[PDB]
Symmetry: D2
């Protein structure tokens, strides 16, 4: 009998509350794709939400979908046209890969390309499996002094990088970050790395705020039942001034209103968190003080920069990982996520290496 073939066990969502571990064919890379032996994949609210509700807004799982989109792996095989990667290369995978070179791509904002492929966003299958193929241009080699988990953390870190860029965060800025979830945390890390003089972080959880303090938050504010205006007042009282940039990472209407009231005139309020379709806010207040309201849709051109920051030890995201499980314990990992006691949970897909 022939030698046993490799397997491609994958974590799949079939519908609400229907999560399964099942085998998939081994992908074959096209001329400009590479086949990756998946190593580390972090999970986030998006994956868990698809599992629980089978959808996220207009994004609905109409057919079984493989989850996972924050990952790194090892190049197993390369397509006939791939030149910058070779078997054995450790790489970080940027999940959003444009299908066509449209005007958004040409202008440098490929994240807005309407037909972009994106891991784990229906109908595009994610990378929480053994073997995964991806456009080679969006697989970035990791330096030897950067771990697989760091490579996987580049995905959430990139949201923070993109958010701070969109907000214009720069040297000496006083920045308000609403929310101490993993997104608010990476935003904090990026803001400090970009030279923000003071970063104030808010959240409903004292626990998450204490963690924020641990990694650099200069000031923290636990939100209980204060009004948006009161929050803005407390933030300003703590900073001794109004923050030039507010990065909203909760998606909560009250927080958005607070961001509008708190941001300095001529400043920028970046909306990262996703809330409901409609939001009632004091637009007049923001518009009249020229406080710009800029949204964020994932990211663009952040992987090389993230890798440079990690390789130079300019930022430390390792503290973000609070738990790791092998791919096979995905269900246990998802249930753990729901407990909401951690931050970032890593899934280890390569049986030959379960290390960071």
């Amino acid at each position: 009998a022939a030698a046993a073939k490799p397997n491609n066990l994958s974590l799949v969502v079939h519908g609400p509350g229907d999560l399964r571990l099942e085998n998939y064919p081994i992908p074959e890379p096209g001329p400009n794709e590479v086949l990756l032996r998946m190593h580390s994949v972090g999970i986030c609210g998006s994956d868990v939400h698809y599992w629980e509700y089978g959808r996220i807004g207009n994004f609905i799982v109409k057919k079984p979908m493989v989850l996972g989109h924050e990952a790194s792996g090892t190049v197993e095989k390369v397509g006939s046209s791939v030149k910058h990667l070779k078997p054995g290369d450790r790489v970080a995978i940027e999940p959003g890969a444009p299908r066509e070179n449209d005007e958004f791509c040409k202008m440098g904002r490929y994240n807005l390309s309407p037909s972009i492929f994106f891991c784990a966003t229906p109908p595009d299958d994610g990378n929480l499996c053994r073997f995964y193929k991806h456009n080679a241009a969006f697989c970035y080699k990791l330096p030897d002094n950067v771990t697989f988990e760091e490579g996987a953390l580049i995905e959430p870190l990139s949201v923070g990088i993109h958010a701070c860029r969109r907000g214009g965060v720069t040297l000496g800025h006083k920045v308000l970050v609403c929310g101490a979830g993993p997104i608010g945390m990476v935003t904090l890390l990026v803001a400090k790395a970009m030279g923000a003089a003071q970063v104030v972080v808010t959240d409903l959880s004292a626990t998450r705020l204490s963690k924020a303090k641990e990694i650099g938050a200069d000031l923290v504010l636990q939100i209980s039942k204060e009004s948006p205006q009161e929050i803005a007042r407390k933030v300003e009282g703590q900073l001794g001034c109004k923050p030039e940039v507010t990065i909203e990472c909760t998606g909560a209407e009250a927080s958005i209103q607070a961001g509008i009231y708190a941001t300095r005139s001529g400043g920028t309020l970046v909306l990262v968190g996703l809330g409901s379709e409609m939001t009632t806010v004091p637009l007049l207040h923001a518009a009249i003080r020229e406080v710009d309201i800029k949204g964020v849709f994932r990211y663009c051109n952040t992987w090389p920069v993230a890798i440079s920051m990690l390789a130079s030890k300019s930022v430390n995201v390792k503290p973000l990982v609070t738990h790791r499980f092998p791919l096979e314990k995905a269900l246990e990992a998802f249930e753990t996520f729901k407990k909401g006691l951690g931050l970032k949970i890593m899934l280890k897909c390569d049986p030959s290496d379960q290390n960071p």
Copy 2:
């Protein structure tokens, strides 16, 4: 007896529905100010609103306030430190003059200076009178080939210049302008002068849209009871694509929502129109497609540019003037404004010259 002294008849609002023509002392210019013999002053909804309600938002007339803030005049006398202006110079007056060189002025956005002085915005007296003194740095000499009325029209034109700048309007753009009032009209003029390939103007009035066409609107849409999504659909239908920039000049919530749905991803929605304190809008929609929402608060650094555009005949604002009255007929002029049949009404304050 001595020769008769000059007079400074002024148009003053004492409260809701209390408009009066009364004499004021002749201002004496300080070292860095100039005394102007007012010539042409255009009036707008702001002046009329202070007349009708004695206030606009939180800006309330607590003591009689002279109206007018869109003006030009002739330098009568100059302060001991003034050197760029001399008696006889025809000048356009920029109404907003900072009282202190704060961080906003230093960074180039003096319009956001908290303590800025602004004509006809309580408690600062306007210039609808015979003689008015103003900071010399904010009085700009008009070239011989630019009329006083064009000089007065620089104020509303500047709102359009600032709005298009904030929106990033540039060569080849498809621009949507919501509202065909004088503000939407100057915005249309500026957008076209900046190279916009197509400008679509919307409004409830067919008459205003017809006028928009006359001065350059490539396409127009009369709005009735369509929903914001339907408006967005129609605009896109006319353009065959989504406008990269939308300049909202109505303040109507429905129009703001339409702008969010209509604007191309990565584009900009500029909020010029003033509406209610709170607004319900689809921020999530704008965020996911990175449609920036930028407000406008008057303007900054637009007078020299406006003057250059007028002197080179790059724009023609004259069609905006639909009526002109001598200062003494200010009441009739405000009554005519209330008829909402015109566009821009000019008040002529210099008895020696009532010409454009």
Copy 3:
């Protein structure tokens, strides 16, 4: 006997002074390429220089090269993956097509991609022939009201568009354009279309300056033997001020120095013309007044905008065409170019349609 096959007569440069018309195989389009029946191709100094010297700097013809890179044509056949174009579509061809999605492409500046393919720049064959294949993403459909020659003129127009963007040309600017060659002319057209209040054009030829006047030049200055400082003085005297932007389209050292001396502090000097490897200039003068010196390497993201400006009749480049010849008279066309009496010479490659 079988029907006669089509031909692909091409204009080829074999070495200095060795220009030949010879037949080439009919290209076969790959999955994302389209085969074009070439219609109109404009020629410029680059093509003529390759013919005369067999090279341009480090760009040397090491093997016979087909000339031509300013063109338009009709889609003859489309690759299996092409979706936005179909046979019969009239298209404008952007000559620079990236071979790989590197960081320059992702960041929105594909013109800087080191491995970019570019028509008629050794070793990449141009499109002065009957049939030519090209990446479909870089073939743009022409509206019915835009001619083939206009489509071909988009290439030089794009240099002007890119140059003005790089220079920050905007509403009300006083712009100095050095050189009245076709590049200086399209720059002039673009500057005016972007809202420049006054454009001053310089040149050694009164003839070219008169042509410049005809298409919009507000002011012209024929250069004889004045020094750079004298030129700067005359330009300022004519404008009554220093231009905020200077676009150098001659590549001449003296002109570059003049641009440095003439540009307003805080302004921008754009270098479009190609001179010698080294240039002696008053860097200190520019640097100390923060006059930025920005170069231009062809263009990026200008075709859709150019098409929008042409389709909306916002700019008129037709006056630029001073002569047209069928492909077969290429030698006569090149000799005519050398006479330097015209501006843009068009080659007509489609025997079935020799019209504009």
Copy 4:
């Protein structure tokens, strides 16, 4: 007899090699000025150059000029219109203060205002004395946790802040800094604080490079007689890529050329160093790869930011101070500077407090 009056001993240059300590009248502050009891004043090559040659370029000392322009002090008295400062306030003094609100000030680039007043640049007297009056808008209160010397170091630090801003230095960038003098050093500090992943510093002195390493330089290159291309090659060799930004802080022609060759395409070469009037450089090389060349003229809008960075301990400039002398030993301090063995020399003007 009456009580002894205070003195205003000043360090004055009468001409080449003619430095004197002499008494000046005590300045009386105007309505918008403040009188400062000078505390700490750092000296730099500019002060020393005026001493040695009695001039710098076209700025010539035609009458005795008080030196010093990098200072901090204590508010002694305030003008009748000053409200943001009071007696006893510790403040940092920004030396460049505009005399008129011209278009440069209005646009946010007051450093380019032609009539700007600037300490110790003939004919404007500096602040190396006991009492000095200055525009109140340009005196910034220092937080309690920021020393007077740090306040004085804000001036050179601001050159670095402005330079990095002009260069677009940001997160993850690889930056090349040419020159390890105090200017290159502060530039290094700022680049790292702004998130640069790697900063390479070059210099002729191994000692200065060793000091650069001590404060953060990731890589250093000692320059001997290598050519500009060789320097560019070596820099790239160390980084494994080309730096996105190069900040030239030597003024040496060879270094400027190296910067052009070394900078990544689409990147920026910032010219801070002052050299000869004319410079021979490969502009064609920079243009073809769109390497922008931006000069720096002091700074604008950097004091509040510097103060925020110092108060938050985001940067440490203290290591730059290599020696401190009381005002009375100014001659010895200038002699020590000429020994070129230190970096930043501080002069202590307040006899009541000679501490940092």
